[PDB]
Amino acid sequence: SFDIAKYPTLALVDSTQELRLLPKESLPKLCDELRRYLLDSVSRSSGHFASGLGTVELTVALHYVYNTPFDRLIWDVGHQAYPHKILTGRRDKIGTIRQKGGLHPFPWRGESEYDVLSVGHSSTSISAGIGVAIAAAKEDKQRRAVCVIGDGAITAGMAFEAMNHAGDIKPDLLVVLNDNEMSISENVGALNNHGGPGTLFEELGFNYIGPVDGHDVLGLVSTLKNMRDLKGPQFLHIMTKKGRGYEPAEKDPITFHAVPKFDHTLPSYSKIFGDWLCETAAKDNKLMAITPAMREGSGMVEFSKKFPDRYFDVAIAEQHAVTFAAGLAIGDYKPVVAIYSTFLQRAYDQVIHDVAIQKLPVLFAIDRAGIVGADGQTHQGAFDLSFLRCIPDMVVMTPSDENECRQMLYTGYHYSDGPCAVRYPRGSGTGATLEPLASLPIGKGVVKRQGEKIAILNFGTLLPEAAAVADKLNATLVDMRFVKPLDTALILQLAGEHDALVTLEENAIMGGAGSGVNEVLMAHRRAVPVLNIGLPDYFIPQGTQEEIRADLGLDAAGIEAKIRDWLA
Amino acid sequence: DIAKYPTLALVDSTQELRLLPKESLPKLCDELRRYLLDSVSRSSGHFASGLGTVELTVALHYVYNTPFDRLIWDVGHQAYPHKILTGRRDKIGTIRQKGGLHPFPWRGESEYDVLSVGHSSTSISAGIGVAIAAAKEDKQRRAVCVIGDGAITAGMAFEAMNHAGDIKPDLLVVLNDNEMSISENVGALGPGTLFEELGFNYIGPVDGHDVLGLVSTLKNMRDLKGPQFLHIMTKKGRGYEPGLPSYSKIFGDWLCETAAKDNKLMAITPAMREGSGMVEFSKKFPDRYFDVAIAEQHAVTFAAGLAIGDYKPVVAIYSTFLQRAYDQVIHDVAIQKLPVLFAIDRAGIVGADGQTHQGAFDLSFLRCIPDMVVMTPSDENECRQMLYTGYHYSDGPCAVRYPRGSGTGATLEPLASLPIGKGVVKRQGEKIAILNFGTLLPEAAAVADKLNATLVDMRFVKPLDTALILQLAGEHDALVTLEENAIMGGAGSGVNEVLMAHRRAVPVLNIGLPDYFIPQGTQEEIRADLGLDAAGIEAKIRDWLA
Ligand SMILES: CCC(=O)c1sc(CCOP(=O)(O)O)c(C)c1Cc1cnc(C)nc1N
Ligand SMILES: CCC(=O)c1sc(CCOP(=O)(O)O)c(C)c1Cc1cnc(C)nc1N
Ligand SMILES: [Mg+2]
Ligand SMILES: [Mg+2]
Ligand SMILES: [Mg+2]
């Protein structure tokens, strides 16, 4: 049922062993067909478009020259790995990618022996590649090791750490730099600007080759076959064009980075946040805003245009983003770090050591909190309420709608005693009225409904579901607003007035907001059970945000069901 | 006082220092060096690092207009001369003591301490933020930081340099190159080529013990625009020619013993060979010992690669430094289901190093991550048993966390895998059950007999012995949890969650670290102050039950 007529050469390729059976003279035609196949298949599945178009020729060359899967190939991030999957046994399922029950959005160890490392977060390729290259030397067979890392990903500190270590330990590893002059938006940094274009990499201890034409499959084959045989850390710099082969994408690589389903022939919280940045900077000279390479995702495009000298993209450097903000605060400016919950994991030590321990007032605006949807396990905003909660002198807010979100950003922005964090999900609010801004009382929740027997303590954007449940069970419903500090007096009062409590968060149950409530009740030697509703103790799989929420029982029907089963 | 150190007598503030003639700065450096050798030889601490920054510290405060101009010390272990010159001369003898001067520069302690340091490599990053603000302030404030050759190996520092080379802040970075961090710096490291390529104006390397040369050099570079990099060379220790087994030694002994017969074992440290007890290991199995420099991130992800290659990696890392590798643990080990063993030293209270170094959170931030096994040994035998257990546990990563200092002398039994997620009942009592996670067990044992309580060694923070917890809850009026970790999100909070999930609202007293960064002192003092000895544990229970 695969169009052999349209794809006569690709048809003969369903495994890399078949691929290596072709004569090199046919690899160009196969590249044209892979690209054609990708173009309409991703057109209908939605997802990462221009990235894969940019690696077609590279992927063909790599699997033609390397004896995969014995030889180990690691793709960084994996946003560019659709051709990789198509050539490695998943040709006829590429259309299901990013869908519930379909191919993982990125390479996944459990999906194929061809996926050496599960990826999603960036810049892990070189680090893992070194480990597998050292192992391969010890194994003393002739196993080869190669990774592909983007010009954006290579700005991360861990890529520098790995490159420096390779130059010392000298592993037999090939690093392919897929240089397309792009991150998601345009790439930044002193490296991005950097006679020898490989002078830096040679200083780090690598044998540098290039730059070379990343869309020249036969040249890549000849050059890769050579470098595969070379000893020690090797570094091949290729140039690709993002969206190569599709002019709209070649002209707008940002827009076509992640596409909806298209024919190739309400305010979001991100936008609520960026709008609040513009409106604050407009009347306050102290506001400064920081992103680690996520301008478009965090909603900062308009802000960057209107206030260019207040906007800072530090490249893919979550760590520096935070300690840079601490520096601005030390110099009496008011910095805002915009950062996804999942990527905030990488700057945890800077939060603790360079902000909380310092009592510096940095505002953290944590986007993609909770279930993120089709990006799946590697990207989930699943743990910030838990890992932030345990750090002393941190304020942690969970807005329930777009107005609460603005009131909390404003609150944290003007809170000068120490760090504040405001976390919100990907997607749109309720249409709530945007009221005038004033600081909310710290650590105080808001009663929304008075019932009996059961009280629901909601933390975050799942409030509408709790409200529908509250009405059906005649429950009391409170919007806690603060994960830290908790409204202790409120918790104690409703415990004395109900037989059972329920907590609701879009965050891991273990150590989360509801666990903090448990701790308060225990600390006061109470004897009221609490049903902690939140994320289960496994990494959340891919799907529609609404799909996965229903699947985990985080909708009104699932919450009511959970409560009833728990009450015997 | 004055007779011994005449020039030092005159400078109790940097304002006076900058009024001295240049010609007298060398004499000042000798007295400052002598003054150092008297006080730290009787107070302990990081004095050899300070001996090597004597001239640089004098040159910096002489040239820059501190405290208006902003100077940032990386780590802070080389900043005793700094504290001495910034009004704390007479209290330097108290450094690292309970209620003394902080071990490292601390903002709350002096307007001359621009950034609290302890963790390494933060200086450049903060220095860029300070420099950007100083430019917008438009008042000619200068910015300068000092980072060592070890600290500049961290990813953090590269990201800052990459940013500064693009954005071009008015910042001086002084590379204080002494050829080794704690141990010899091991990494790829024109000595200026990297920094020039990253966009800096590079000068040096110069003689870091030539105070007049540094003065003149720093005067020039302080007035240059954009990112400036001064490479200096110093000698570590410039001026001075030179019980029971700790858990670090226990782990190192286990390492050597396992590697002796198992060629698959690989041991990794981010530049903490001595602290983590791996010196003998490193001499005995050099081709399977990996010091990745001060790069906790790469440490973990390299181990993932070794495990993908069917080798058996062990990552030795302090709890406090493990914070900087959190994303690699989650994304590159736990999401991968890869069986990396984490040997987590300085768990709990670390003592004199104070707030920046406490092992205060690993039970909390590890426990919320799916597919992690977290083990808290109560003694040195249990620690060997648990390292063995994790080493041979193939389904996923395992973490074994233990405190700085010595164990109890427990008998070291033959090694066998421990049943996963199961506690050991140590004492059957009445009314109350104490559930211990880790090395406070003996304190808990004293309380349990005093109160005629049940006592359990929980062993696993994750997965918890759910069956045991529920049985305990049906047999007692109250439970008590104990751990050397933040109460918030900690191990006992884990127990709370199991009881709530089963609707077993039996009250639980969570004993652990309170919600503030723990200050400096001896581990014993601080444990007593926090009520984590037997006397404090009993009083907590009694107060809570009244
Ligand atoms: C699905 C793709 C994706 O999440 C991408 S992709 C990309 C540009 C890379 O540029 P490139 O390497 O292609 O040149 C960024 C910045 C991100 C988000 C991100 C941010 N921070 C970390 C540690 N990890 C990330 N993944
Ligand atoms: C108080 C002294 C101290 O803890 C030192 S000191 C030093 C060598 C630096 O070498 P140097 O920079 O002087 O050349 C290390 C490696 C450490 C431990 C450490 C490890 N990891 C981080 C992120 N932070 C740290 N602080
Ligand atoms: Mg790119
Ligand atoms: Mg060469
Ligand atoms: Mg050094």
Answer yes or no: are the C-beta atoms of A175 and A145 closer than 8 Å: no
- 3-state secondary structure at position A467: helix
Do B330 and A345 lie within an 8 Å CB cutoff? yes
Distances in Å between the alpha carbon of B191 and those of B125, B154, B163, B229? Answer: 22, 18, 21, 12
Homologous superfamily, domain B247-403: Thiamin diphosphate (ThDP)-binding fold, Pyr/PP domains (3.40.50.970)
Q: Which helix (H) or strand (E) holds A422?
A: strand A420-423
Distance B179 CA to ligand 5 centre (A): 6
Beta-bridged to residue B143, according to DSSP, are B70
Report d(CA A542, CA A89) in Å as an integer: 21
8-state DSSP, A348: H
Distances in Å between the alpha carbon of A66 and those of A222, A356, B212? Answer: 12, 48, 59
Closest C-alpha to A51, from A111, A127, A107, A117: A107
| Residue whose entry in the numeric block shows the structure tokens 């944590």 | A366
Closest C-alpha to A258, from A87, A373, A108, A345: A373
Class of domain A8-259: alpha beta
Answer yes or no: are the C-beta atoms of B402 and B383 closer than 8 Å: yes
Report d(CA B81, CA B272) in Å as an integer: 25
Domain coordinates of chain B in residue numbers? Answer: 6-233, 247-403, 424-545
Q: Identify how many contiguous H helices and E strands chain B contains and give both numbers.
A: 22, 17
Q: Identify how many contiguous H helices and E strands chain A contains and give both numbers.
A: 23, 19
| Residue whose entry in the numeric block shows the structure tokens 């109890």 | B408
* Pairing, β B201-207 against β B228-233: parallel
Distance A390 CA to ligand 5 centre (A): 33
* Phi, then psi, of B356 in degrees rounded to 5: -65, -20
Tell me which architecture the domain covering B424-545 has in CATH: 3-Layer(aba) Sandwich (3.40)
Burial annotation B314-327 (CB, 10 A radius, 16+ → b, else e): bbbbbbbbbbbbbb
**DSSP code string of B190-227:** -TTHHHHHTT-EEEEEEETT-HHHHHHHHHHHHTS-S-
CA-CA-CA-CA torsion sign (B56, B156, A51, A308): negative
Beta strands in A272-333 (DSSP E): 287-291, 311-313
Tell which residues of chain A come right before a gap with C–N over 2.5 A. Answer: 194, 265
* Phi, then psi, of B482 in degrees rounded to 5: -140, 130
- In the PDB record, what is the listed experimental method? X-ray
Distances in Å between the alpha carbon of A158 and those of A197, B252, B292, B294? Answer: 21, 27, 11, 11
Greatest Cα pair distance in chain B: 80
Report d(CA B94, CA B100) in Å as an integer: 5
Closest C-alpha to B20, from B110, B81, B85: B85
Q: Is A181 exposed, middle or buried (CB count within 10 Å of its CB: 0-12, 13-18, 19+)?
A: middle
Ligand 1: residue whose CA is nearest its atom 15: A184
Give first-to-last CA distance, chain B, whole Å: 56
- 3-state secondary structure at position A382: coil
Beta strands in B402-442 (DSSP E): 424-427, 432-437
Q: Which residues of B touch A528 (CB under 8 A)?
A: 505
Distance A149 CA to ligand 3 centre (A): 9
Catalytic center residues of A: 242, 318, 346
Tell me which architecture the domain covering A269-423 has in CATH: 3-Layer(aba) Sandwich (3.40)
| Residue whose entry in the numeric block shows the structure tokens 């902080």 | B102
Alpha helices by DSSP H, A154-268: 157-169, 190-193, 199-203, 217-228, 247-251
* Pairing, β B424-427 against β B454-457: antiparallel
Does residue A79 have a known ligand-binding role? yes
Report d(CA B354, CA B349) in Å as an integer: 9
Q: Cα B412 to chain center, whole Å?
A: 29
Distances in Å between the alpha carbon of A274 and those of A365, A373, A430? Answer: 10, 22, 18
Preferred mutation among A124, A146, A316 to probe B, highest tally of B CBs within 10 A: A124
Report d(CA B391, CA B261) in Å as an integer: 14
**Ligand nearest to C-alpha B153:** 2
Report d(CA A451, CA A307) in Å as an integer: 48
Contacts of residue B214, defined as CB under 8 A and 6 or more positions apart, other chains included, come to B55, B56, B59, B206, B208, B232
Report d(CA A392, CA A402) in Å as an integer: 28
Answer yes or no: are the C-beta atoms of B463 and B395 closer than 8 Å: no
Report d(CA A377, CA A366) in Å as an integer: 18
Answer yes or no: are the C-beta atoms of A441 and A410 closer than 8 Å: no
- 3-state secondary structure at position A512: coil
**Of the listed B33, B236, B422, B540, which one is catalytic?**
B236
Closest C-alpha to B160, from B121, B107, B205: B121
Distances in Å between the alpha carbon of A138 and those of A146, A165, B287, B356, B529? Answer: 17, 18, 10, 39, 51
Tell me which architecture the domain covering A446-567 has in CATH: 3-Layer(aba) Sandwich (3.40)
Report d(CA B480, CA B492) in Å as an integer: 8
Report d(CA A255, CA A257) in Å as an integer: 6
Report d(CA A137, CA A530) in Å as an integer: 54
| Residue whose entry in the numeric block shows the structure tokens 């905030």 | A344
Beta-bridged to residue B434, according to DSSP, are B455, B480
Answer yes or no: are the C-beta atoms of B322 and B344 closer than 8 Å: yes
Answer yes or no: are the C-beta atoms of B47 and B36 closer than 8 Å: yes
Residues recorded for chain A: 568
Return the HEC string of A49-99: CHHHHHHHHHHHHHHHHCCCCCCEEEECCCCCCHHHHHHCCCHHHHHHCCC
Closest C-alpha to A125, from B251, B332, B384: B332
CATH topology of A8-259 equal to that of A446-567? yes
Residues recorded for chain B: 546
Report d(CA A18, CA A64) in Å as an integer: 10
**Cα atoms in the Cβ-side hemisphere of radius 13 Å centred on B38:** 14
The CATH number for B6-233, chosen from 3.40.50.510, 1.10.3720.10, 3.40.50.970, 3.40.50.720, is 3.40.50.970
A158 lines ligand 1 (CB under 6 A): no
Token duo for residue A415:
């809170």
Count other C-beta atoms under 10 Å from residue B243's C-beta.
Answer: 6
Report d(CA B179, CA B135) in Å as an integer: 34
Q: Name the resolution in angstroms.
A: 2.0
Beta strands in B389-477 (DSSP E): 398-401, 424-427, 432-437, 454-457, 460-462
8-state DSSP, B74: S
8-state DSSP, A488: H
Report d(CA A47, CA A14) in Å as an integer: 22
Alpha helices by DSSP H, B45-154: 47-51, 54-63, 80-83, 123-137
* Phi, then psi, of B240 in degrees rounded to 5: -110, 115
Return the HEC string of A120-144: CCCCCHHHHHHHHHHHHHHHCCCCC
A121 lines ligand 1 (CB under 6 A): yes
Query: Is B296 labeled as catalytic in the residue annotation?
Result: yes
Closest C-alpha to A491, from A464, A467, A523, A538: A523
Q: Cα A202 to chain center, whole Å?
A: 31
* Phi, then psi, of B222 in degrees rounded to 5: -60, -25
- 3-state secondary structure at position B445: helix
Report d(CA B378, CA A158) in Å as an integer: 34
- 3-state secondary structure at position A350: helix
Q: Which residues line ligand 2 (CB under 6 A)?
A: B 75, 77, 118-120, 148-151, 181-182, 270-272, 294, 321, 324
Considering only CB atoms, B370 lies closest to which of A130, A314, A537, namely: A537
Report d(CA B375, CA B483) in Å as an integer: 12
